[PDB]
Amino acid sequence: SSHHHHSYTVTVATGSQEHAGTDDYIYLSLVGSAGCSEKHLLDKGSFERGAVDSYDVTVDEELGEIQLVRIEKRKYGSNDDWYLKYITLKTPHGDYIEFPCYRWITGDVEVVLRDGRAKLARDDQIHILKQHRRKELETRQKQYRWMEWNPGFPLSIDAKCHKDLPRDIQFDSNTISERVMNHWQEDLMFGYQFLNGANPVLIRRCTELPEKLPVTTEMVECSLERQLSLEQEVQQGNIFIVDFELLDGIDQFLAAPICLLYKNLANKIVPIAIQLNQIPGDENPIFLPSDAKYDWLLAKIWVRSSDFHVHQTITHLLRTHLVSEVFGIAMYRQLPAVHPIFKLLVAHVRFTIAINTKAREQLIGGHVQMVQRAMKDLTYASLCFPEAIKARGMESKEDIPYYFYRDDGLLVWEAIRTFTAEVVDIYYEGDQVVEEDPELQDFVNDVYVYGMRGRKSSGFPKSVKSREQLSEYLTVVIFTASAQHAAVNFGQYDWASWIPNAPPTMRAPPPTAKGVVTIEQIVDTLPDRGRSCWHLGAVWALSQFQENELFLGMYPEEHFIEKPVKEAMARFRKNLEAIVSVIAERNENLQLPYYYLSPDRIPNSVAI
Ligand SMILES: [Fe+2]
């Protein structure tokens, strides 16, 4: 499939995408240290999918060391876009030089490629390179611009529809759901989803009963099993609470449930109380598992309903999609392609801007009110996975044994943390070098000022001044964009296919009295078939891995070409293979297996 044309040996790899090929004319210059060359027009034909064509380009004069490669596409009828993977040169001196690309080339403008080796701003002293760096950012900084889609939202790409985006970022039943069908009425299943379900990030250990939940030991006598009072079971750390105060005030109904939970003698977490709204009172009853059958159950259906909106809106859309797009745009604006941090993150922002852009145009009022309020909650510390687990009081595995999200997550986290630390070391000699990287700082500073609206209380670094800190910053970007998204996105069908376990909408208001609810008003309180059909299709489509799916650590596009960083990639891959094995054996001795955070099921980016 490799076509050779017959003094420089110019190899041109074309992309394997559906439209990757082109038929226009392709002119290719070389820019050495001793002077540029002439524009050699590739002789004939068209470059089609999966192609690798090599040309022998003779030059009149010695060019010295090669610094840049120029590409220019002149039309042959309607402009057929062309995806260039990479360009390699075999110079007459015997040198081999790889020029990575991975960019669509419309032919509107020239494309100048640097050497494959990653360079910082400080590594470039000759004018030839400095000017290219500076004109690359200038073209970045006007193609990828910021724009506030909704008030108080994180700023996003300045583009209304998909095809407005630059061409380089444009897009080209179950084992668990069955079990949720035969058990969703069990307090065990209900509580289990708070740890190993689609949205396992809300539960927190309780250290004192809220005053807005006037629950007494007598009401939960029958649920407690340690012969202790509710007040004392809280001290021992056996009470857990899930509070939806984020929904209080949102504008065919909503609720603000407070759900109290208990770690029984089986070290399982089951529900023992449910108050569907925030302000207690006699028309806001505290439902109990000892209440009438259809009361305690409709009480749990509302908690499911609420957990599903917070999941999709906040846990899913805001804290993964919108957050990755932020890092994504910042990366394009401030980091030239030759920058080591670019080469690393460019694979974890792949398609995020395009997938989001698609969601915004197709989607289109109460769910905008949740983001604004979530927005004040979003903090850099809340995205560092270890701390985020610890802030919620769920760190102890001896006290909280069955928390697979936390267990697998902490593994994947420190696997990525190890990678970035290594890669950071291969390119930054000392902390001084980090603090002085002018483009790295402009990257951090865009995330903080435009992404996070410059909100001082978000905890995002205004600047990065150490290798430790840069490694943490990078791990937060790669982790949130891959593992964290994989855990909250790929469960939407396993846990939300069966409607009574994740009602997208509720047709009736929450019950205000006990002994009234009947199976009939539960059925008609649940969503319509038309709403259910759309919901079923949406959750199934968003839980499907594409056939070209690139999983964590798959870097088929070689932006990195040096051995030190490839080796660090090798270790990263092997280290992920160890976590896949461990997660495999654990899920062997499990009732119903948790696998969303297995690295061979963790996409590279937020793509769906
Ligand atoms: Fe998603």
Task: Provide a compact summary of the structure.
Belongs to the lipoxygenase family. The protein has helices spanning 127-143, 175-181, 187-196, 230-235, 293-334, 340-345, 352-363, 366-377, 380-383, 385-391, 404-427, 431-436, 438-451, 467-481, 483-489, 492-496, 519-523, 529-541, 563-586; strands at 2-4, 8-14, 25-32, 40-41, 52-57, 66-74, 82-90, 96-105, 111-113, 146-147, 156-157, 204-205, 239-243, 258-263, 269-275, 286-287.
Description of the molecule:
By secondary structure, the protein is an alpha+beta fold. It folds into three domains: 1-116, Lipoxygenase-1, CATH 2.60.60.20; 117-200 and 308-605, Lipoxygenase-1, domain 5 (Up-down Bundle), CATH 1.20.245; 201-307, Nuclear Transport Factor 2, Chain: A, CATH 3.10.450. The chain has helices at 127-143, 175-181, 187-196, 230-235, 293-334, 340-345, 352-363, 366-377, 380-383, 385-391, 404-427, 431-436, 438-451, 467-481, 483-489, 492-496, 519-523, 529-541, 563-586, and strands at 2-4, 8-14, 25-32, 40-41, 52-57, 66-74, 82-90, 96-105, 111-113, 146-147, 156-157, 204-205, 239-243, 258-263, 269-275, 286-287. The strands form four sheets. A five-stranded mixed β-sheet has the order 1-5-2-7-8, with no helix packed on it. Strand 3 (25-32) and strand 4 form a beta hairpin. Helix 5 (293-334) packs antiparallel against helix 13 (438-451). 43% of the residues are buried. The structure holds fe (ii) ion. Residues 485, 489, 542, 606, 608 line the site of fe (ii) ion (FE2). It is found in: Cytoplasm; Nucleus matrix; Nucleus membrane; Cytoplasm, Perinuclear region.
